[PDB]
């Protein structure tokens, strides 16, 4: 029970982390490639972004 | 004695409230200081940016 | 002149300067100012901006470089030549400036200081300067490119 309630949560956690990393990459990459823009500060905050 | 004292047996409500209000006041007061400090850091980051 | 070399071991370490009502000088530069009428006025340091500020004598007062926070991109002068303001950065052609150039003002075309330099990096055919600017509201802010060094 432990082993399959720990392996399960680990698998789900790694998938969720990988998904959150991917969704961040997609969020930040456009601004990352525009050196100049006004970032949406709510999106600058919710993702890691070093605003202007 | 037919009982055993327990190191809380004399504190009483009044002294409890005193220790309470004192510690709470200090904790809140430090929390104020920390809050004003973090708020100044965030204000400066928006001040640059 | 209206900016003064602070001195150490005879060899000017940093030109400090007189802006808008206050002599300013960078904290890292360590030196006697070379103007007796300033060389002792206590300095109020602030490390968040790497600078030290102090009121100029009430007689000195009416010599004091003007300033302004409105700096549209373009050409601005500088002792060692022209500086260019593009893409919210001040840049200088390569190899001009270094140890000794700290704290000299950057003036506009009407002659008012817009910035006081604190450092640099040579980046290809140009040099980005780490500087102290008066932001769009007039608040002072230290703008520094990455890796910039104390001049």
Curated annotation (Swiss-Prot), chain A:
It is a single-pass type I membrane protein. Residues 25-52 are cytoplasmic. A lipid is attached at residues 27, 47-48 (S-palmitoyl cysteine). Disulfide bonds join 27-48. Palmitoylated via thioester bonds. These palmitoylations may induce disruption of the C-terminus transmembrane. This would result in the reorientation of E2 C-terminus from lumenal to cytoplasmic side. It is found in: Virion membrane; Host cell membrane. Residues 26-46 are annotated as: Transient transmembrane before p62-6K protein processing. Interacts with spike glycoprotein E1. Processing of the precursor of protein E3/E2 into E2 and E3 results in a heterodimer of the spike glycoproteins E2 and E1. Spike at virion surface are constituted of a trimer of E2-E1 heterodimers. Interacts with 6K protein. E2-E1 heterodimers interact with host VLDLR or LRP8/APOER2 to mediate viral entry. Interacts (via E2-A) with host VLDLR (via class A repeats); this interaction mediates viral entry into host cell. Interacts with host LRP8/APOER2 (via class A repeats); this interaction mediates viral entry into host cell. Plays a role in viral attachment to target host cell, by binding to the cell receptors VLDLR or LRP8/APOER2. Synthesized as a p62 precursor which is processed by furin at the cell membrane just before virion budding, giving rise to E2-E1 heterodimer. The p62-E1 heterodimer is stable, whereas E2-E1 is unstable and dissociate at low pH. p62 is processed at the last step, presumably to avoid E1 fusion activation before its final export to cell surface. This is Spike glycoprotein E2. The chain holds residues 689 to 740 of 1239 of the full protein.
Swiss-Prot record, chain C:
This is Capsid protein. It comes from Eastern equine encephalitis virus. Forms an icosahedral capsid with a T=4 symmetry composed of 240 copies of the capsid protein surrounded by a lipid membrane through which penetrate 80 spikes composed of trimers of E1-E2 heterodimers. The capsid protein binds to the viral RNA genome at a site adjacent to a ribosome binding site for viral genome translation following genome release. Possesses a protease activity that results in its autocatalytic cleavage from the nascent structural protein. It is found in: Virion; Host cytoplasm; Host cell membrane; Host nucleus. The modification Phosphothreonine is found at residue 3. The active site is at residues 28, 50, 102. Homodimer. Homomultimer. Interacts with host karyopherin KPNA4; this interaction allows the nuclear import of the viral capsid protein. Interacts with spike glycoprotein E2. Interacts with host IRAK1; the interaction leads to inhibition of IRAK1-dependent signaling. Part of a tetrameric complex composed of host CRM1, host importin alpha/beta dimer and the viral capsid; this complex blocks the receptor-mediated transport through the nuclear pore. Interacts with host phosphatase PPP1CA; this interaction dephosphorylates the capsid protein, which increases its ability to bind to the viral genome. The chain holds residues 109 to 259 of 1239 of the full protein. Phosphorylated on serine and threonine residues. The very N-terminus plays a role in the particle assembly process. The N-terminus also contains a nuclear localization signal and a supraphysiological nuclear export signal (supraNES), which is an unusually strong NES that mediates host CRM1 binding in the absence of RanGTP and thus can bind CRM1, not only in the nucleus, but also in the cytoplasm. The C-terminus functions as a protease during translation to cleave itself from the translating structural polyprotein. Residues 2-151 form the Peptidase S3 domain. The record marks 76, 109 as: Involved in dimerization of the capsid protein.
């Amino acid at each position: 029970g432990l082993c399959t309630c720990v392996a399960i949560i680990m698998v789900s956690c790694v998938t969720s982390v990988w998904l959150l990393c991917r969704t961040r990459n997609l969020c930040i990459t456009p601004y990352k490639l525009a050196p100049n823009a006004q970032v949406p500060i709510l999106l600058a905050l919710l993702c890691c972004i070093k605003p202007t | 004695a037919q009982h055993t004292e327990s190191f809380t047996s004399a504190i009483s409500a009044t002294a409890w409230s005193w220790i309470k209000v004192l510690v709470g006041g200090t904790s809140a007061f430090i929390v104020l200081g920390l809050i004003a400090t973090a708020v100044v850091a965030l204000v400066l980051f928006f001040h640059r940016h | 002149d209206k900016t003064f070399p602070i001195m150490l071991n005879g060899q000017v370490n940093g030109y400090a300067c007189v802006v808008g009502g206050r002599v300013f000088k960078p904290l890292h530069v360590e030196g006697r100012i070379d103007n007796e009428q300033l060389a002792a006025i206590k300095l109020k340091k602030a490390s968040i901006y790497d600078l030290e500020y102090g009121d100029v004598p009430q007689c000195m007062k009416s010599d004091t470089l003007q300033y302004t926070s409105d700096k549209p991109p373009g050409f601005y002068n500088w002792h060692h030549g022209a500086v260019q303001y593009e893409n919210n950065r001040f840049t200088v052609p390569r190899g001009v400036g270094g140890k000794g150039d700290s704290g000299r003002p950057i003036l506009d075309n009407k002659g008012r200081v817009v910035a006081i330099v604190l450092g640099g990096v040579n980046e290809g055919s140009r040099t980005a300067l780490s500087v102290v600017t008066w932001n769009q509201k007039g608040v002072t802010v230290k703008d520094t490119p990455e890796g910039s060094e104390p001049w």
